[PDB]
Symmetry: D2
Subunit: 237 residues, 4 copies
């Protein structure tokens, strides 16, 4: 199986598999069942911003999700990611819809990682920033249903021509370049990511959610990972 | 008094004022008596790197110090800096020598702060000019002909003097919190070369963040690392 | 006098002092009489973005100014900043109104300078604090709520006043060049909102780089864009 | 064929293909016959640094190669790269040896590209920085003889176990992610690249050279590109 660490923006409470009973954000380490969650006062139709950060010293993976004009939801979880993830990962966004649906539209996404090893000055680094997405985002690995639309947005899950979300969709976008997040001599590794996202839905209870995730580089959408498993895991273990 | 948060690289154990009894790195929050420390296996005469990180979501200030080929030392401390520091600060490096001495040479120093929403401030020196107009040099701090920042006095032959204190603040105030940023974060790194003729060098060097008008407190020499007026 | 290099977004032709006869962007080196200009199809009431860059290897200072959905205006001029500016500078935005007027509202401003192979400075404001401690506001410049930098005076409803001059300098000096640097470069962008009820708005705004102690020169009102004491 | 733009550090004068009669740096636009050259006081055995910059408003591609105790050499070329390169490219370093040889060791390599538009927020940025190269650099595409060695260096051309450069070698390393180097509606696109390199040679006249280059994303070492073609071009046209 893949090895996944993710920050989930989980619209739909699958109490069935451990979600809290409300939309929430969560930090997922090798399981869809979040190690930590926070209630998320999700607002459809309004652009949200997620900022996710980690450094290997603090070993604290944190996420905050906010919309202008509203209180942010924060969740953090202490985890030494280097003991969970391989040295090389890819980073990506995933989203699914299921029986209930929503757009999982990413309007921008940036990411910066640094890997500082003891014997070198400066920290290898990788940064990418998209304030919009091309038609052909050659630097993204689009998995599943993910595509970019006319408007320059990355629709992780299928939307119609007019942008209306489809059910039972799963899509991910990984940044093309593997990211080096640890190494034998590493002193400190960190990464920060932000994305903005627009979740719209005609459903009164939208689903399923959007994640930023980090994975083995050859990560692919697991079989059976649709819907509540957020395109990340093959089961709800 | 100033409001100080610092990561100290404390070479000299003043067990007196609650240092652990070995060189250590520490997170200091409004006191020289670190809120968290970790044994620092110093390597006098070798270039060290320190990296210090915080973000307001994680609320964990951490530092790691390392040398080439060496195991690192880390220390972290849960702290919400927005409850501690004013929203505008200056960041700086400080160092002292005391009865024992050491060079407190900073070879490089970078800092990035973000207040996201995305104000950012980043500087990086891999060398310091003779006249570093973007530093506020306080106390004994100078830059030398190598473009190194000598936080404490060293003789013309690079020999460190005792009873020295010096700091260098970055010139621009840093906006580290604001009533509506969603997250504020900063990271700092510096490389330093502590050499000493002494069996147990002293006293230490720090990266610190302070009220913008921070200045070396009177009495802050030696074990007070140029940061605090007393050991409270 | 100060030493000024500037990219001017000059709304108002003062052909008397060598403006071309249309709104134009310009590269000014030590004189309001731009060394190079390009026609600027202003779009009053629309947010514009200006990107200015320079690299000491290319020795070309360039600026482009665009509004969303419209063709950009670009102007470049070969210049060796190290023969023009002191090595330490402050960078800033200036703007003026004179007989005619416009808002010179800066909504965001970022800047990055590097000296390789040594220094970097970067700052970015997506909004400006009510009290931007890291800006030196000169003349009439203020920040409003809405978090904008109003370089020139606007009424409490935001209507621009004439005969205003305002500048904002980033607080830290920037080491814009240095003799042993292999490359010096910098990049700046700002977005601005010029609105005016005048059918011939004026006068303009600039991003400029100056000796660190630069101040609004006397008589630099209006067509002098807050940068120069005369039109030489 | 590939579309190549490169800054060559050309140790070896192939005057038969228009090289000047001395080591030189050059800006190559779709040809090994550089559009502009500058005499390069190559400092064998010393680490050099190259800085390359371009931006589409200035439209000047420039490079400086310096060492810490002689050269600078600078070369620039006015070129609108949106008219030369595809909008998506990979960026890389290449180097070759021929009959004569030299190490083409890269000690560090950084690159930043931006596509800027109507915000202080890039429409896109890509930055990477390697101050050392891992033994399995998953974010590099190593082509030809390029490998990383045990010192953390990227040896673009073959070096023996003793570190002795071999002749007839070509190697390139591309950053893994395509870079959107321009785009129809970007207001400004720019890139900067820096790398440090160490050319050592036991030859009286080391050869052949090393480049930083930008190419179609699917660029490969042209057959017939060894030696004076620097791994970039299929011929000397
Ligand atoms: Ca769920
Ligand atoms: Ca002590
Ligand atoms: Ca004018
Ligand atoms: Ca040649
Ligand atoms: Mn969940
Ligand atoms: Mn201590
Ligand atoms: Mn003018
Ligand atoms: Mn050549």
């Amino acid at each position: 199986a893949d090895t996944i660490v993710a920050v989930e923006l989980d619209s739909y409470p699958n109490t069935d598999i451990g979600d809290p009973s409300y939309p929430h954000i969560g930090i997922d380490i090798k399981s869809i069942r979040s190690k930590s969650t926070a209630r998320w006062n999700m607002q459809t139709g309004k652009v949200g911003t997620a900022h996710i950060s980690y450094n290997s010293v603090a070993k604290r993976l944190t996420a905050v999700v906010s919309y202008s004009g509203s209180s942010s939801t924060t969740v953090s979880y202490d985890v030494d990611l280097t003991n969970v993830l391989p040295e090389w990962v890819r980073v990506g966004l995933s989203a699914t819809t299921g029986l209930y649906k929503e757009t999982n539209t990413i309007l921008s996404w940036s990411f910066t990682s640094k890997l500082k090893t003891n014997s070198i000055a400066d920290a290898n680094a990788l940064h990418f920033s998209f304030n919009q997405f091309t038609q052909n985002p050659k630097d993204l690995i689009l998995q599943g249903d993910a595509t970019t639309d006319s408007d320059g947005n990355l629709e992780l899950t299928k939307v119609s021509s007019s942008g209306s979300p489809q059910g039972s969709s799963v899509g991910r976008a990984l940044f093309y370049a593997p990211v080096h997040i640890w190494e034998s001599s590493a002193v400190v590794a960190s990464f920060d990511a932000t994305f903005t996202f627009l979740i719209k839905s005609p459903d009164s209870e939208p689903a399923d959610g959007i994640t930023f995730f980090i994975a083995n580089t050859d990560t692919s959408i697991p079989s059976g990972s649709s819907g509540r498993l957020l395109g990340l895991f093959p089961d709800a273990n």
